[PDB]
Amino acid sequence: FRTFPGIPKWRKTHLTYRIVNYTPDLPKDAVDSAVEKALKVWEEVTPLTFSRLYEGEADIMISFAVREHGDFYPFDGPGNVLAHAYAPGPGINGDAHFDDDEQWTKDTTGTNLFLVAAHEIGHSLGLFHSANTEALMYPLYHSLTDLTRFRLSQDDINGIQSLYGPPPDSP
Ligand SMILES: N=C(N)NCc1ccccc1CCCCCCCCCC(=O)N[C@H](CCCCN)C(=O)NO
Numbered sequence: 001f002r003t004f005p006g007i008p009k010w011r012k013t014h015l016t017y018r019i020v021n022y023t024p025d026l027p028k029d030a031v032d033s034a035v036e037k038a039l040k041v042w043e044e045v046t047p048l049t050f051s052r053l054y055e056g057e058a059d060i061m062i063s064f065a066v067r068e069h070g071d072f073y074p075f076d077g078p079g080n081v082l083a084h085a086y087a088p089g090p091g092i093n094g095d096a097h098f099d100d101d102e103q104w105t106k107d108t109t110g111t112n113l114f115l116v117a118a119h120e121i122g123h124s125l126g127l128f129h130s131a132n133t134e135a136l137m138y139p140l141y142h143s144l145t146d147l148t149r150f151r152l153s154q155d156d157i158n159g160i161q162s163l164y165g166p167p168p169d170s171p
Pocket residue numbers: 080081082083084085115116119120123132133134135136137138139140141142145150151
């Protein structure tokens with residue numbers, strides 16, 4: 001696995017997130033659910049937990065945008081770049097932006113928000129891209145991915161636990 005230069009990481013266990021805006025592609029509940037599920041994937045392999053804020057500045061600010069949207073990395077329209085996130089830290093760091101020129105769906109008919117979100121939260125937590133072709137952190141989306149068999153690879157777990165450690169206990 002790979003981390004960010006300087007190995008940035010959250011210095012606290014209880015993190016907060018907030019959905020800044022909503023895409024027209026899906027109903028609000030579908031967006032909230034996808035994000036919650038993406039966060040759950042990581043909470044179960046670390047001693048971290050997440051709480052939602054509806055106002056103010058949360059650690060992880062989530063939003064949808066198109067083309068130029070404020071940062072040094074404008075989106076490219078439909079296809080190619082699907083989203084991007086920033087390493088742990090204050091301000092824009094830890095935030096995740098989704099390209100709304102993509103057709104976000106709850107399933108795989110279009111671009112599954114859950115899968116992409118899970119990958120982005122990986123960056124928000126301090127993980128960069130992996131060369132391991134089975135890792136969630138390997139930068140490649142495929143429409144034929146089977147959601148029912150989704151799970152983190154050992155490379156993703158090793159990586160995230162090298163930063164925050166494993167959960168205090170297990171079933
Ligand atoms: N087959 C495997 N292992 N797939 C994982 C994987 C494993 C298990 C289940 C699903 C997936 C796919 C998750 C989707 C990951 C996103 C795919 C990358 C799309 C292109 C993109 O948006 N790239 C930017 C890079 C921007 C750089 C611009 N210079 C990025 O990465 N942002 O975060």
